[model samples]
Each structure stands twice: as structure tokens, then as C-alpha cells.
Target: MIIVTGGAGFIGSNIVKALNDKGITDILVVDNLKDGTKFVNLVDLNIADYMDKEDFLIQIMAGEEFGDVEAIFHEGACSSTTEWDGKYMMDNNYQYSKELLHYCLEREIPFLYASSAATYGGRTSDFIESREYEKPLNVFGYSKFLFDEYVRQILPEANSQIVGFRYFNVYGPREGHKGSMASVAFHLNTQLNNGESPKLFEGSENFKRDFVYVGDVADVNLWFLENGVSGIFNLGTGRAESFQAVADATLAYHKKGQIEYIPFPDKLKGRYQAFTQADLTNLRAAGYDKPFKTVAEGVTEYMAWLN
Candidate 1:
């Protein structure tokens, strides 16, 4: 059986569905359902065989119940980009990840984990490979970066055995209830359906993101699972698209007209990223040759789901 941490979450639920599509049924799920509607995503997909976060860890680490488990996809963590609790974020994202990494290494189980692109911290240098210039701007990003650095230091020579994916701005279906952290696609779709114009942050009208489709991200995970790939790799389309472009695409998908731009909040004025893109050289060198869907194509699919 394969254990999928955060198996009921947005990306995790989609990954579960993908595994089911491949006729893989012996699966176990682990997630914490505190205040969030992760249950909604689980019920939407009808996945029931799951363990609570704490219990799942005990079984995997102490009880050795996962002795027969082939792989452990450690995708669970506090994914809130705006979360300000430094200690709590460290415990959840860093300490827990360290425990899991230690357990996986002890058992020699193939472990795949979710890293974050937030660790890049506005750097314009090519973000395709692991570099020494990582200085995260937020605690949430720093938490993930801590684990990445730990894994690199503890298992440098065994890089081929572990996989860390630094995900870009990921968005797709089943990502409801993420509140402000949810993708712009979700907000724009809601506004369009209500006959309301989508809002964009002002001043930084050219803000861009390497937005990636959740399905493609799932495909990349499975690709690494099958190929035993390793190292910190950026999971993105190697392209950048502006927020204005995203709004335009969303409107076009819904057959709607123009969207109006609103002034950004004063607190967020200088912090916005005017330009962001992913460098895919490392992914390509690692033999990940899948054709990535463009923003237009991905937004089209997302609009279909919204409609």
C-alpha cells in the first residue's frame, strides 16, 4: 500500500484520483482536518480509508505498520502562505518533515515530498536547480526551506533516493476553502459566474506567476515515483504569465468581456512580484519531458470545471 500524506487536500485528493485512475487501490491517506474542509474534497472523491494525521505518523514510525508500504508521499503541511505563526509553522512544516525523512531513510523507503517555490524569495536567477542563494521572505517559505536544507545536508550523496518538488503557483479544481490562499482562478470563476468583474492588484499590474496545473503536478509526482528521480526540482511549465493575462484568459473562457483592476492594498504594494517565471532546465535534465499545458489551456480546463 502507498501512503499519501494530506491525501484529502487539493493536490493530494487529485493525486489520489490519479492513482485510482491507474487501478491502484491499496492506498492509505493521512491528513489533519482542523477547521478546513478537507473532508469536502475527500467526500467529493469518495475516499474513506484514511487515518488522522497524528495516528498515521505513529503507525508509520513506531508501529512499523507501513513496513510493506512501497512509497510515502509526504505532502502534508501548513500550506498557508500568509500564516504568521513562526513556531507553529516550524513544528508542522519543518519538524514533522524531519521526522518523516528520518523514518523513511531508516527504512530505506522511497520518499517524495512537497517543497515550495516560496523559498526562492524574489530571486531572478534561474530557479530550475538547487542553488545556494535561498533566503525566504516569509516564515512559511522558510519552514519548507529548512527541511530542504536539512535533507540536502543529511543525504547529499543519496540525492537520487529522495525527491523534493519546489512547486510554483499551483491552481486547479478541488481547491475550495483555501480562503485568500486559494488560486485566482477560483476567485475569478466565482466573480464571472456572479456577473461581477474579477479584481486584480493595482500598481503592479504586470505581476506574473509560473502557475501550473494541478494535474500536471500530479503527473510529475507519478513520473518521479516510477523513475526513482531525486534532488530538489522545480515543478512548473518554465513559463511566466501575468495576472492580467490570467484574468483575460478567465474572461475569455467564460465568454465574458473585460475585467477591471482595483488598487492593491497599501500593505501589499511593494511586496508583490512584478515578474516571476520557472526555469525548467533541471526538470528537463532529469528526463521529465512531458509537454506542459499553457496557461490558456489550463485556465480553459479550470473554467470548464467552474461552469
Candidate 2:
């Protein structure tokens, strides 16, 4: 058996689907379903059981039996970059991940978890693991960065295989529920399909990001699991595409109007990342030689799903 925490979420559910594609069905999925259509992402997935995250954590803490589980995909976390609730972020993103990491460490279970490109805030230097970047502009990125630091501190003697992915701007199917957190791919497509011009921020052509596909993210996860690769890696396509490129591709996929530039919002003043280009040198050196889908390719695939 395998356990997938947050298996109902965007990237998590994508991982579940990839596992199922490999005929792995003896899986247990865990997430907080509270009240949302995000559950739709899991409707088509095959699983042995499901557990709410809060109860699941306590259950495992109380010595609940999972019966010879093979691995744990720890994707559950409060992933809001704009959220101001520091205490909640600490408990959910930092403390919770620490507990899961320890459990995997003690049992020697293979663990793969989500980190974020948000960890590298506004910086002009090439995005590399060894480079020192500015402090995260928000608590969410800080939480993820802090956890990665914890991993480095404990990795010297840990027996378990652990891989952390500092995911770039990921976008694809099954992310409609992320609201403001959804990828520009999803958001732009929605607006264009609704007969509205694709909205771009002032000087959006200069704002570049290494947009990655969720499917590719899933593939990378499985690659690490099968290859026994352990440690942190940057998850991205390696080529940075601007917001104008994203809007153009999204509109070209389906649109009746041109790109519209809007003023940058005050709410995003000090927290936005103006340029993010993932340096995949470390990932390539690690033997993950598979190619990633381009922004146009990924956007087209997702548009097909939406249409």
C-alpha cells in the first residue's frame, strides 16, 4: 500500500493519476475535503481508502495500521503565498511537514514532498540551489524555505530516500479551484474563453517564469521514486516564458481579442516575483534527462481538456 497526502489537490491528484496509470491501485489518499468541488479532481481516481488530513495525522500518530505501505507522497500543505496567517502557516506547512519527514525517516520510507519557487524571491541571479537569494516576501515561501533548510540539517544521517521539488509556475488540468492561486494558464484561458481580453500586468512582457506542466511534475516525482534519487531539485522546464508569452499562447489557443495590460495591484506590492528562471543544471546532472512540455504545448493540452 502507498499513502498520498493531499491526493485530492492539484499536483497531488495529478501524481495519483500518474501512479494509477502505472497500475498501482492499492493506494490510500488523504486530504481536507471540507467544502469544495476540488473533490472532482479525485472522482476518477482509484484508491483503496481516503482520509481527512487532520484525522489521518492523528490516526497515524496513534499507531494506526497502514499494512506494509511502500512509500509516502507528502503533498499536503497550506499553499497560499498571500495568506497572512503566520501561525496557521507554521503549523500546516512547517510543523506538519517536519512530523511527516520524521515518520518517513524512522521507517526508512521513501518520501517526496513539495517545495516552491517562491523560496527564491525577487532576484536577478540565475536560479540555482547554491545561490543565495533574497528572503521570501511572504510567510508561505518562508515556510517552504525553512523546511528545506531543516532537510539539509537532518539529511547527513537520514536513512530514508527524500526528494524535495522547488516547483516553478505549475499549471494544467484539475486546478480550477485554486482561485487566485491557480496558474496563469488556467486563469488566462478562463478569461479568454469568457470573451474577455487576456489581462496582463504593466510590463508583463518583462515578467518571466519557468512555467511547468503538472503532468511533467508527476513524471518527475515517479522518476525520482524509480531511480532512487534523493535530495532537493528544481522542477521546471528550464526555459523562462514571459507573461505576455503565456497570454499570447493562451489567446492563440482560443481568443477574439488582444492582450490587455493592467496596472499592477497594490496588494502585490512587495510580494510578487518579477522574474523566475529555473536553472535545471542540477536536475539534468542528476540523470532526469526527460524533456518538459513547452508553455504552448502544455497550454494547448490543458485547453483541450477545458474545451
Candidate 3:
């Protein structure tokens, strides 16, 4: 059975849906449903079994085997970048990932997991997947960055596929549950739908990001699983589009709402990233030749699904 951790969350759910599109249903979904509202993400997904993350961990630690595990998509993590509890963050994102990584390595099961662009914070430049360019701004990024380091140490000797994706500004359907952490496109669509003008930060025309579609991200994961390559790679469109582009796309889709510029907050003056574009050199070098969707294409598609 194929296993997807955090299978009911944003990108994870999208991955599950992609698998279903391939007629793959013998899947096990592991996640914590304490936030019961996430059930909506699973209502339409077909899976062989569902287990709480904690229970799955226990069984995994006990060396219990599931029926001929094909591969594991380790998408589960404490994804909140503002979350400051270092202890919980390490345990959930760092430690849990280590355990799963070791399990996959021992069994030679292919493992594909989520890292983040937050791993490149505190600076607005250089998003290459390397040590010198990494400067995580929070506990969350640190958790992901540190794991990437751990994987790097074991990568040279590993015989199985272990791909880590440092995702940058991912957005698409099934992300409504990620309150506050949802993409700018998601919020813009919400504001317009509420009969309010789409709101954007002042000088949004200069603030750029590589807003990749979640569907493309899922496709990359499956591509790595099939190609059987092992390495950490940056995942994005490789083109940084302005926030104004996102707003304009939303307006174009709705054919109504004008953009309302908001004052940039003082607290975020120095902390926020003004630009981020994933350097896809390594991903391309590893043989992923598909083009990623632009903000105009992705946000328009997302709005159609969201509304």
C-alpha cells in the first residue's frame, strides 16, 4: 500500500487526489484529526485504511510491516511558520521525519517529503538548495532545514530514493483549512467573494514570489517516485511573479473586484521577503522537464475550483 502522512491537509490531499486519478486506491492515510474540520478533505478520497499519526508511529517503531509498502509520501509536519514552540516543532517536524526516514531507508522504500522556502528566510535572495544560502528565520524553517542537512549526510550512502522538496509559495485547491497560512491568492479570492475589493500590500508590484500550483507540486512528487532519484531539490516555477500579478489574476477571473492597497505593517518591514524564486537547476538536472504554471495560470485555475 502507498502511504501518505498528513494526507488530509492541503498539499497532501492534493497528492492523494492525484493518486486516485491514477486509479491507485490501496493507500493508507496517516494524520491527526484533532482538528476535525479537516475531514472535508478526506470525504471524497479513497483509501484502504486510516490511522492516527501517533498510532502509525508506534506500529512503525515496532517494526510492524504493512502489505508490501510501495512508497511513502511524508507530507505531514507542524507547518505553521509562526509557531514558536521549539520542542513541539522539533518533535513533530524534525524527529518524526527522522524516524520515518530511517524506516524508509531500512526498508528501501522510496520517500518523498516536504521542506519549505521558509528555509531561505531572513534574506530576499539566493534560493538555491545549498548550505550557504540557507538561513531559516523561525523554528519551523529550522526544523525543515535541519532535516535537509541530516538527509544530506546520509544521501551519499543511501541506495533508495529519498527526495526532499523545498516548496516555495504553494497554492491551490484543498487549502481552505490552512487559516492564515493560506496563499495570497486564496485570501484575495476570499475577499472578492465577500463583496470586498481584493486587498494587496502597498508596493505589491515589487514584492515577488514563485507561487507554484499544488497540483504541479504533487506531480513532481510522483515523478520522483517513478524516476527513483534521491536528493533534496527546490520546487517552484523558477519565475518570481509580483503580488500585483496575483491580484490582477484574481480580478481577471472574477471580472469585478478592484485592488485595495494596504499599508505594509511595521512589524513585517524587515522580516518579510520581497522576492523569492526557486532555483530549479538541480530539479532540471535530475530530469524533471515539465514547466510549472505561472501565477496567472495557477490562480485562475484555483479560483475556478475555489468558487
Query: What are the candidates' C-alpha RMSDs?
Result: 2.0, 1.3, 1.5
What are the per-residue Cα lDDT tens digits for candidate 2 across 3-64?
99979999999999999999999989989887578889989989899988898878766666
Candidate 3 stretches with Cα past 4 Å from truth are 263-270
Model 2 / residue 295 / CA error / Å? 0.8
lDDT of 3 by residue, 31-150 (tens): 988988898988998989999999999998888898799999999998887777999999999999999999999999999999998889866667899989988877889999999999
Top candidate on TM-score is 2
Residue pairs with clashing backbones, model 3: none
| Tens digit of per-residue lDDT, candidate 1, span 208-306 | 889999999999998898999778888888888888777878988888756777877665543444555788888889999998888899988988986
List candidate 1 stretches off by more than 4 Å: 44-48, 60-63, 157-160, 266-271
Name the candidate, 1 or 3, with the larger lDDT value. Answer: 3
Model 2 is weakest, by summed lDDT over 10 consecutive residues, at 125-134
User: Backbone clashes in each candidate structure, one number apiece?
Assistant: 0, 0, 0
Question: After superposing candidate 2, which stretches have Cα over 4 Å from the reference?
Answer: none
Assess every candidate by TM-score. Answer: 0.93, 0.97, 0.96
Error of 1 at 9 (Å): 0.9
**Residue pairs with backbone atoms closer than 3 Å in model 1 (clashes):** none
Against the true structure, candidate 3 has what lDDT? 0.90
